[PDB]
Amino acid sequence: PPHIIRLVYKEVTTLTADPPDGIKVFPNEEDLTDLQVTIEGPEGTPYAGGLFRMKLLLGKDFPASPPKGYFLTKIFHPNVGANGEICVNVLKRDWTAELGIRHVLLTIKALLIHPNPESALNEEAGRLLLENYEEYAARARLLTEIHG
Template sequence: MMKSEGRMSTPARKRLMRDFKRLQQDPPPGVIGAPRDNNIMHWDAVIFGPNDTPWDGGTFKLSLQFSEDYPNKPLRVRFVSRMFHPNILADGSIFLDILQDQWLPIYDVASILISIQSLLCDPNTDSYANSEAARMYSESKREYNRRVRGVVEESWTSDW
């Protein structure tokens, strides 16, 4: 059991313990996540690139930061691994509607990680964060996929 300076019983922390328990008991395929250093408010996660896609074989690391307002307010999540994607900035920030204006308290860590995983193969073409990746995705899929494969290979050697 995790301890943290006697503030264990806040609603956000209780909810995060539930999210963690669910992830352990019923892990969705292709994603893992856990609190970092026994700090329930800060998690590390990994998304595995979906099979039979240019992302196949990739292991992409993410950082999840929760506030005491969770789940009423969305978490801050970003890729730690280098990414090349229309909806992901160079700093790893992810442009995904459910992490911004479409957030609902019903979303838990598992559903967020699954949504990010599906975003990899299915970018939101209405809202771009990386214009180079967006242009390449729409104009030259082959070149885009080649860049993605490079990011996948890099994910095997990058450190935590």
């Protein structure tokens, strides 16, 4: 689909021109709907110092609906499930089709800073976060040192 080609152009060029801090995007030359992404773990969080790889699958309907996202880097996070699937409450609730990849990635980076344990795919991470933050952070830091 041509809109995908133009759309990836529009999305990737701007992302690389005024890059958000710690974010980089690698279009798969074989399949432009598969967008690979690295996000540096924000300072002052358990993910600090890590490089987190993820992919964004842009459906044919993008941007009518947001992409599906996966952390390829193993991570201990309330809103990241066993297969690496991401659940972002602002994406599934306040999405409009004027938004694009920049918004998606800033929302995911911001979720690393302030996870949402209510909508937790990883229920252990979510309970620790609310009830025993130090134990959540210790487990999030160790996976960061191994996998980031």
